């Protein structure tokens, strides 16, 4: 507190940490979704939800409490009978198309990362990226 708050030593991992740059020497960070245990758990939860959704009845109308103003005469069709059925179908199908969304997302991410050094200014303009792109084109 009173004295120098840094106290650099000859470790370079405490020295780098004390000045802010700690994770900046590792390739990729540490995350939670990278373990098979959490993956199995998430898959279990998703399968349970899909099971519950599929065990619903097909005839799943909804009484909307605003049908009062629509003077239904036992022959007309209520304009809101399919509102919980539509939501159930939407959730079920969205849960069944998860891998497709994952694939499209990873395609987008890869095709936007591969062009980082060409589309992002502060990466394209550093002397090191420019030097590397020049070094590749040496005839």
């Amino acid at each position: 507190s009173e004295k120098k708050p840094i106290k650099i030593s000859a470790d370079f991992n405490a020295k780098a940490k004390s000045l802010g740059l700690e994770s900046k020497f590792s390739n990729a960070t540490k995350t939670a979704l990278g373990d098979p245990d959490t993956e199995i758990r998430i898959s279990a939860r998703i399968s349970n939800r899909i099971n519950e959704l599929e065990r619903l009845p097909a005839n799943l109308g909804t009484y909307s409490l605003d049908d009062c103003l629509e003077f239904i005469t036992k022959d007309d069709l209520s304009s809101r009978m399919d509102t919980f059925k539509i939501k159930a179908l939407v959730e079920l199908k969205s849960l069944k198309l998860l891998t497709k969304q994952k694939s499209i997302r990873q395609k987008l991410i890869n095709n936007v990362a591969s062009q980082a050094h060409h589309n992002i200014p502060y990466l394209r303009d550093s002397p090191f990226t420019a030097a590397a792109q020049r070094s590749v084109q040496i005839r």
């Binding site: 370079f12 390739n27 998430i42 399968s47 998860l98 891998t99 990362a113 090191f128 590397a132 070094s135």
Partner: protein
């Protein structure tokens, strides 16, 4: 459809993803001419991103003082 069930492995996206910010730029080469050949070109820095002394300082900080 041909889309698989969302519980079938694999289920991870960035398992083999590499951002360009880690692409192993080119550096010095550090040739070695025998043992008694001291009047010999030690480096080969043609298409390097950083010069020889800075590469040596990086090596010194990260590797030379690992012990």
């Amino acid at each position: 459809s041909n889309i698989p069930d969302p519980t079938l492995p694999p289920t991870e996206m960035m398992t083999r993803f590499l951002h360009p910010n880690w692409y192993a730029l080119p550096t010095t080469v550090w040739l070695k001419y025998g043992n008694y050949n001291s009047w010999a070109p030690s480096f080969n820095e043609n298409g390097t991103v950083v010069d020889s002394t800075t590469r040596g300082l990086i090596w010194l900080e990260r590797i030379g003082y690992m012990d």
